[PDB]
Amino acid sequence: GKATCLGMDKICSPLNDVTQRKTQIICTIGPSCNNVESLIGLIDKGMSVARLNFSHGDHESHFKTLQNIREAAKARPHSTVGIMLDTKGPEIRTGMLEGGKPLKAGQTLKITTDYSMLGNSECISCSYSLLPKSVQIGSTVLIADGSLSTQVLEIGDDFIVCKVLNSVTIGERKNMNLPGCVHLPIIGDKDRHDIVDFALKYNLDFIALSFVQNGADVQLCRQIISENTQYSNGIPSSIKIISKIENLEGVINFDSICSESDGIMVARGDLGMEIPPEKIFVAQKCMISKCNVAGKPVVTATQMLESMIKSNRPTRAEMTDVANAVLDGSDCVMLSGETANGAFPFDAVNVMSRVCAQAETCIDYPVLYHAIHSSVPKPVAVPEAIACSAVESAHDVNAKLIITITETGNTARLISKYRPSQTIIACTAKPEVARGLKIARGVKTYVLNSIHHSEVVISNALALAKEESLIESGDFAIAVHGVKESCPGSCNLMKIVRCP
Amino acid sequence: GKATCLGMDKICSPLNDVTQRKTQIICTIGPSCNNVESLIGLIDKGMSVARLNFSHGDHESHFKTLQNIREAAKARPHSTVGIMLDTKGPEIRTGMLEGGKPIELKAGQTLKITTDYSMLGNSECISCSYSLLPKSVQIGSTVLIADGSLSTQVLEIGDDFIVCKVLNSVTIGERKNMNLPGCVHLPIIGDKDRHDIVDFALKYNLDFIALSFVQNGADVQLCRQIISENTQYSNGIPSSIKIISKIENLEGVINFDSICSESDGIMVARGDLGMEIPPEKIFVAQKCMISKCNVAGKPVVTATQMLESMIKSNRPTRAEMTDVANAVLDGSDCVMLSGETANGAFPFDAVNVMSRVCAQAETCIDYPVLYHAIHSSVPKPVAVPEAIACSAVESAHDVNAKLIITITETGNTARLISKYRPSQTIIACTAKPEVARGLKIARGVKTYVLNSIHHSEVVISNALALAKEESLIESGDFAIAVHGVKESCPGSCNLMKIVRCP
Amino acid sequence: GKATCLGMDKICSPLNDVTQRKTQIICTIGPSCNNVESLIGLIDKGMSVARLNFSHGDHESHFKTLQNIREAAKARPHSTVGIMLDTKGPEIRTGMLEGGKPIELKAGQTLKITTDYSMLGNSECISCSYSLLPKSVQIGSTVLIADGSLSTQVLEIGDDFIVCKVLNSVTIGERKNMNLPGCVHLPIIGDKDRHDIVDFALKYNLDFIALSFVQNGADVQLCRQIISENTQYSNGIPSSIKIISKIENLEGVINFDSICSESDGIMVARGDLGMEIPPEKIFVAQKCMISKCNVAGKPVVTATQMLESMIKSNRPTRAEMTDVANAVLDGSDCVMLSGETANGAFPFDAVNVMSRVCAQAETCIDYPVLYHAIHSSVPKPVAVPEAIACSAVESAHDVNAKLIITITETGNTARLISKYRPSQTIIACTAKPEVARGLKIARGVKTYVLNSIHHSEVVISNALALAKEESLIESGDFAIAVHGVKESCPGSCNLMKIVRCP
Amino acid sequence: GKATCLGMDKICSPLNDVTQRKTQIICTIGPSCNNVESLIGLIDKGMSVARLNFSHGDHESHFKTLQNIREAAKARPHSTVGIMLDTKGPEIRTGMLEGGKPLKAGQTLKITTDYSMLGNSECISCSYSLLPKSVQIGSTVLIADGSLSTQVLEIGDDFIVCKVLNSVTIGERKNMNLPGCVHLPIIGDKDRHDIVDFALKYNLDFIALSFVQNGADVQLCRQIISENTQYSNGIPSSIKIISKIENLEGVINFDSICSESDGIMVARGDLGMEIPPEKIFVAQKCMISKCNVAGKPVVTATQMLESMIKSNRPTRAEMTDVANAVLDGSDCVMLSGETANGAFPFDAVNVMSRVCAQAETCIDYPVLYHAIHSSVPKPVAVPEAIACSAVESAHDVNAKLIITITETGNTARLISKYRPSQTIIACTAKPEVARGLKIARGVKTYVLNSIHHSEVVISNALALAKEESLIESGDFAIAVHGVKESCPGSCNLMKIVRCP
Numbered sequence A, D: 001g002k003a004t005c006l007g008m009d010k011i012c013s014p015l016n017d018v019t020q021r022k023t024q025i026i027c028t029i030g031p032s033c034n035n036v037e038s039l040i041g042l043i044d045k046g047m048s049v050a051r052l053n054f055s056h057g058d059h060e061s062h063f064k065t066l067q068n069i070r071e072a073a074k075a076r077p078h079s080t081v082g083i084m085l086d087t088k089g090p091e092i093r094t095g096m097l098e099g100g101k102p103l104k105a106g107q108t109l110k111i112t113t114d115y116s117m118l119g120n121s122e123c124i125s126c127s128y129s130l131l132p133k134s135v136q137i138g139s140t141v142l143i144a145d146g147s148l149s150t151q152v153l154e155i156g157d158d159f160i161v162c163k164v165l166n167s168v169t170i171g172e173r174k175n176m177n178l179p180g181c182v183h184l185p186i187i188g189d190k191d192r193h194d195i196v197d198f199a200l201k202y203n204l205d206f207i208a209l210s211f212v213q214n215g216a217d218v219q220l221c222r223q224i225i226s227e228n229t230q231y232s233n234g235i236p237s238s239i240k241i242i243s244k245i246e247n248l249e250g251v252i253n254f255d256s257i258c259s260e261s262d263g264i265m266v267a268r269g270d271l272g273m274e275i276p277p278e279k280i281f282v283a284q285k286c287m288i289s290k291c292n293v294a295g296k297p298v299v300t301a302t303q304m305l306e307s308m309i310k311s312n313r314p315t316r317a318e319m320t321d322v323a324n325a326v327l328d329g330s331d332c333v334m335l336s337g338e339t340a341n342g343a344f345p346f347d348a349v350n351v352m353s354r355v356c357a358q359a360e361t362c363i364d365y366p367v368l369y370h371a372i373h374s375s376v377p378k379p380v381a382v383p384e385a386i387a388c389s390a391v392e393s394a395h396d397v398n399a400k401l402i403i404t405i406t407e408t409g410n411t412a413r414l415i416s417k418y419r420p421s422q423t424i425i426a427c428t429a430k431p432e433v434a435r436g437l438k439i440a441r442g443v444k445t446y447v448l449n450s451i452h453h454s455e456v457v458i459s460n461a462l463a464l465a466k467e468e469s470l471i472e473s474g475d476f477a478i479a480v481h482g483v484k485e486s487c488p489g490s491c492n493l494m495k496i497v498r499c500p
Numbered sequence B, C: 001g002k003a004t005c006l007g008m009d010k011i012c013s014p015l016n017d018v019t020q021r022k023t024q025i026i027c028t029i030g031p032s033c034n035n036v037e038s039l040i041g042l043i044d045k046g047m048s049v050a051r052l053n054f055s056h057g058d059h060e061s062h063f064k065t066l067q068n069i070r071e072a073a074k075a076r077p078h079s080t081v082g083i084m085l086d087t088k089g090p091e092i093r094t095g096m097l098e099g100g101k102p103i104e105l106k107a108g109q110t111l112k113i114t115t116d117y118s119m120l121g122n123s124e125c126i127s128c129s130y131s132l133l134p135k136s137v138q139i140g141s142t143v144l145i146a147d148g149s150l151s152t153q154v155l156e157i158g159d160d161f162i163v164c165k166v167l168n169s170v171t172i173g174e175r176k177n178m179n180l181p182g183c184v185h186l187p188i189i190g191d192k193d194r195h196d197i198v199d200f201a202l203k204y205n206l207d208f209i210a211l212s213f214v215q216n217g218a219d220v221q222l223c224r225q226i227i228s229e230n231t232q233y234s235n236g237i238p239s240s241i242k243i244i245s246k247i248e249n250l251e252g253v254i255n256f257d258s259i260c261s262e263s264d265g266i267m268v269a270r271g272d273l274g275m276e277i278p279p280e281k282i283f284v285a286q287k288c289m290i291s292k293c294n295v296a297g298k299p300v301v302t303a304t305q306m307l308e309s310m311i312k313s314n315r316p317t318r319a320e321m322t323d324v325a326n327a328v329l330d331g332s333d334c335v336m337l338s339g340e341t342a343n344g345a346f347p348f349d350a351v352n353v354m355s356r357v358c359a360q361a362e363t364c365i366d367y368p369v370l371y372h373a374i375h376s377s378v379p380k381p382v383a384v385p386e387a388i389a390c391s392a393v394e395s396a397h398d399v400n401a402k403l404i405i406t407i408t409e410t411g412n413t414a415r416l417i418s419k420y421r422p423s424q425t426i427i428a429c430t431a432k433p434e435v436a437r438g439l440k441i442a443r444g445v446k447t448y449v450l451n452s453i454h455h456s457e458v459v460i461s462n463a464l465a466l467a468k469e470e471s472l473i474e475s476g477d478f479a480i481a482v483h484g485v486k487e488s489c490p491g492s493c494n495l496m497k498i499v500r501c502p
């Protein structure tokens, strides 16, 4: 480690201190940060994308929250905020309890498939009616992100009984996992409805597709998008499909899924089920690596600052956990309970940002570039060659910025794949192109009315980047754009400019 | 990363973990595992080294525990257990609480801290071992307690006390450590520490001195002077006891290169590097120091308490396992259990978990990349043993050997092989038990203690037989054997055999 | 080697050499190719640079030849021809023979050598230009004649002569060069050489001074002082004429690093490094000096006469072609024809052969290995032009471009691109002819001279059109274009375009 | 180039001077060095292998020469000399002339298929009776190692007429080449006879198989060896087959030929025919590289010191030519006319040796080892792993020698493949194993009565190597051998010993 020890040589000196975070941040929006004032708070602390978990909320609160995010967005024109719909999918939920939270290690616990039943510390409810017919005796049934472990003793007609293996006092519409076993579709009636009549209807940027198990699941979601063009004038939506790997089937079929998807989302808590706890990091590190090579953005969806749901400070363990997620090659990190129903959403996003910024300094960039550069077969398409020259030139002359003028975001995604030390600024006229880039590592975006006068776009971008403390006068920047006529002809070029 | 994805390809198949842990494990010995039956329990779950924290216990319990470890050692002749004395040094401690029970401090509350150690403290007022506490703190100063779990800010400074605003909701017990601003106001090696080194570590022939709060090369040179001067208990030959320098402050990090060079090993804990290094920067220091050690060929211990939840629980968290795995991937030779073994409800389960996670994380190491990295760091020409060490590791990989055997009087070649970080378990065959124990912080070194090492053919036969009974190798598998010949080689020489297990 | 075996896979298929030579060619101008029609002949077969060896000719023939080269230049506007003055320097020459005819010396015979230059010599007695010849030789000393083709051993030393035992059966002509023991007894830059530089090279605005027998940096600094002091013929601006230091003795080899640094290029001949370096060691020196030049980014010329057989024959030998190929593979920017063009029977055929062999040897270069080698030799950060140069060469490879175009007022970026040794022909577009001519020793640089370079879009259009008519590129093929923008970039900048040939 | 410039740094210093040649040397035996005193002369100057070109000589002179080589061999017990039979094969020869040597550019030259005809400067003879029926008009016919070029004007019943393209005065049973066109077998009646009743009969070491065109040609030669066991007690001879690539067919089929053969022989003069002169080096460099990877010894058979047939000194061009042959990766070089019918055989071998020694110092060994090491797939057989450790250890501790005790020469051939800077000494009880190793780069051999006491073999080898100025007291040597019992078991090992 060379870059990591240059980091330690700075820790041992009096001096300024310069770090700008490139890892994108997803914030799960809920009661704790639902209003316009909180969402502006999250944007300032470094929210890249707003996540709506459609496992929670109702028709009314979903619409209200969308309006609040977009009102908060208008109050910060220099920050672009992506909006992600996270599908319910074939999840299984506990039913509601009598009053509040109930369970002691060694006890038996009954689970009924009558959801309309107020549960206690002996009998609880289950949303899955085929629960007895999809379980054997000795089967492990995990509850609440796999915090409560149980073993099935008895299987009835419309119930099961489970031996509790943990002392814990948590409940109320928490998730249930049935490892190795679930006769539910990946994209059900509700999910096809939520995609068409919310994600497509209100022109969202990301569908986080829950429990993806093979390429065909992603092809199905793409078919729904191409078939339902009613809310986009008859042009298929450019909304991005982020496949969530939540089970061993997904891991087995990763190569196919990763290829079909626009991105990948992995959580340690989900893979916990069928894959032994001491093996999960193997799967997570490999899938992230595979994504880095494929040039597909990967999100570490792991809840990594759990202590910050109740505390204003995290633990040292939690910071090391985030740092390793970044060093593993994560494009993007995610806050769940810390933002959605926690006491310190702003502090949680702030901590996540600072740790990410620090972990990014320990990346040996040369090693990483030459690794990815040698993975792509030659010859390549012009944009990918321009992308490489941008990243190479930037390093060679110690530029602080890479600016790309784009109608699609193609060149920005390609530059992001080569993982430069410099912040990427994607200058575009199309807001959905700007929002769509907000899971890509290191991509800030500037939304303009025109991109036709390249000299002016680069001038205005350098000026705005100056006011965002990304660059100073005399510093180098790489500018990248196409020319349509008299280049001669059409072309793509790369300028090494100086910030005035 | 290709080794990581070969790991994932196995997760998705019908087969049956075929993995042997190479990362060494230190177990802190205390009330929870003090007896002979518990210590045998720790050996079976994979204890490499027994740690005596001389911040705790008294003259009687220290000696009693030493006898118990060595009785447990006799009950497992095929496992070698190193014994480490961890010095008190210039630490600062909280006093006793009211007839026990851990107090629940609430964020926002005030906490008084007195210089009268003989005072039974409560959830408003606690004690401090350091009499110059008020004269070494300003108002607004952060004072960290219990491996920096409780953060507090000083409101008032009295004659012989301070008052502190608690910044955390947290539950802390008795005689926990305190950290104060600066870069240690006491001697590194005091009267007690020079006494503990000479009249315990040297007197009872221990294997490791874990030197607390090392701040520069001179601190290690001082400890070496004490060892060389005090030869009374070792017939007049300086003890070969190994000095493991603990980096517990920014001064130590600044002076690491010097410390690392002087020391036989290095010990780092995330919990100690609290203060002066911001929490979000510590991993930078820890990863760099571990890397530097890997290059230098000095064993490095991650002393971080990483399975804290297992002090009260039978199972760890998924976060804690990922934390251990990353410590191993970062390049740790050695991991450490503190509260999990010393005063916890599940010592055996804690060591078991640590072992299994370590074994899994080791499969994700890209070995070729790591070997060629370290091989190209050493300048040529080299000493014969280091050339033999490289050929052992190369040959082992080339023919897919399961074992590297070294017959040694010193442990020199074993330490060298360990530095090149082979996938194969190293077995150091020796007639000197202190050579065997001394190797137990070196990544991947198991040891076989014999009465003689004179007949090389027999030592290798017996080692392959023992390795067979330890499920390290099977019949028909290749092993690399490495030893010297004293006469008629011709002359003296060092050689490397590619043998087959019968 | 994989590029070499891709070459062999093409030798075994139905297709049709698609290859353009990048190695530059120097042609020595003399009686055999002195007229305007011959020089146009040399341009068409691939002459990069015209060499005037001022060891030969007189004031009149030098001026006449210069006019002929420049008239030939006007008759081929799309080809740029550099003009090189090769200094006499401290050389020693044989005198004239009896009304001509080359003498046949037989191994074992004696040969007398007199200090009376005005003496018509025979196959027993020849002349010498150096009056201190007897006073700078011992008995048994080896005296080499005609680029070290005739070896002789001194038997007797007289007042104003020596007698030598011939060691070779060989046929030598008039006014050939002599080499004597030591590490040059004359000035490097004499009265004649300072005169030839100022009142010919500078006076008539030549492009290269080939500085004979350079022995250290100070020799090159002296030549630079003469150029900077004598600005009379260039309006008071120091001439941008390029100094190519010739390493012709062991002193030069010893001091190479210094010489190479001071010089704009380097010239080495196997024939010169005769004596003090054993014949079987010369390739060691030549390969090393060429390598050093490749790293330093200074153009190096293999001045070795490699097609000697083609002075009398229409065809070369297979040995001579392998010799040229290896000169190119060794990393030569530039090759040279001497007798083959200057006084030979087949100048056009000689240049033609040199071109075809060079083109073939260039296909066997593993380019990736060569780029990453030179890229990792330069420390970061770098100047903008060198970063643009790298991106040009990388982009060119990545998208399989056939051309790299650079618009330049200096030739700076062209020289930098040339240093990274791309597979693509470089076209340096410039308004200054002396910038175009100055680039003609740089590997792979063709040049296009325009009246203006103000409209970048038009320069690139016209360059692609001209490159199309020179069979360098076809419609639909990619080209890299590289130039500065002076205003509204924003500001000034340097950029790289990936364009398509129409 | 690092090693090449360390060579130049030594050229510029006062100091000792230490080089030992590893490239093996083949000497073609003929009238100029036919007697016992000359052959001892060649051994001292550095002859590795004696070549009998069976295109020349008769039954009597072949046998006489074999006796002389073996008498010369007995007079130098510390030097092992391999003996190579070079087959006539499907070659074509000019007939004899009237008295002495005759031809002017532009003239016509008649060629008759009546071999029993004394030829002049208008009409010459040809050994190939099907010459008119295997040529078209405008076909190029090369004579005397392709020195005389001609174009065919007319084709008769039993003749052709050719336009001479060169002024040259050379003749008398010289070779003829017909590029692109020859209805002769690779192994004819004479060649099967020469192999069985000379090479096998008198227990020679190498068959240099002329004009090999594919794997099947080598398989045929191996069939002859396995079928004819009469002169070797019924055990197939371990004689080595060196396939000569003399035409484009051979180059096309190289991979197959190289795989089947024990070695490869390439001459620039032979490939000159069908492959344009300016392309030959491409073929030669590639085939040598391919051999280096495959671990098969390759001989540069090119006549490279032609000037030394008449002169006591070579040209600077000729030395550079030899040096490049070595740097290209040649295991072995060859003298033809320089030894066979030249004025200075001893000087020719001496020059070849000195140049080879110098060119070997310019080899960057690390680059070459890691190149070949990464070409072999793992896992490997024990001997190849021992071979690598030998070469690695040798470099790491700067050993001067690698000693291998062998019954087969297997480990010596493997060590030779990894191209160490150190001389390899193959200690063996079997002389034909010693002789068989003499084309392998850097292998000297010591023939003993026993190899059973390993300690004594290594002692005696270090002592002999001391007397051969290969090593001094205190210098390191690598020793490599098998142990049959009590290793424990059987094994192969590598010792780092010190020369006493």
Ligand SMILES: Nc1ncnc2c1ncn2[C@@H]1O[C@H](COP(=O)(O)OP(=O)(O)O)[C@@H](O)[C@H]1O
Residues within 6 Å of the ligand: A028, A029, A030, A031, A052, A053, A055, A056, A057, A061, A175, A336, A337, A340, A341
């Ligand atoms: N849209 C929402 N409406 C109400 N509560 C929400 C919403 N989104 C999240 N939450 C709350 O915040 C928590 C954040 O966790 P998250 O990962 O989104 O859900 P889950 O508990 O299903 O894993 C949820 O558990 C829930 O208590």
Ligand SMILES: [Cl-]
Residues within 6 Å of the ligand: A078, A079, A080, A443, A444, A445, A446
């Ligand atoms: Cl943005």
Ligand SMILES: [Cl-]
Residues within 6 Å of the ligand: B078, B079, B080, B445, B446, B447, B448
């Ligand atoms: Cl052990």
Ligand SMILES: [Cl-]
Residues within 6 Å of the ligand: C078, C079, C080, C445, C446, C447, C448
């Ligand atoms: Cl040109």
Ligand SMILES: [Cl-]
Residues within 6 Å of the ligand: D078, D079, D080, D443, D444, D445, D446
């Ligand atoms: Cl030999």
Ligand SMILES: [K+]
Residues within 6 Å of the ligand: A053, A054, A055, A086, A087, A088, A089, A210
């Ligand atoms: K969901």
Ligand SMILES: [K+]
Residues within 6 Å of the ligand: B053, B054, B055, B086, B087, B088, B089, B212
């Ligand atoms: K302690």
Ligand SMILES: [K+]
Residues within 6 Å of the ligand: C053, C054, C055, C086, C087, C088, C089, C212
């Ligand atoms: K000259």
Ligand SMILES: [K+]
Residues within 6 Å of the ligand: D053, D054, D055, D086, D087, D088, D089, D210
């Ligand atoms: K033959």
Ligand SMILES: [Mg+2]
Residues within 6 Å of the ligand: A336
């Ligand atoms: Mg969740």
Ligand SMILES: [Mg+2]
Residues within 6 Å of the ligand: B147, B338
């Ligand atoms: Mg502790």
Ligand SMILES: [Mg+2]
Residues within 6 Å of the ligand: C147, C338
């Ligand atoms: Mg000359």
Ligand SMILES: [Mg+2]
Residues within 6 Å of the ligand: D336
């Ligand atoms: Mg021949």
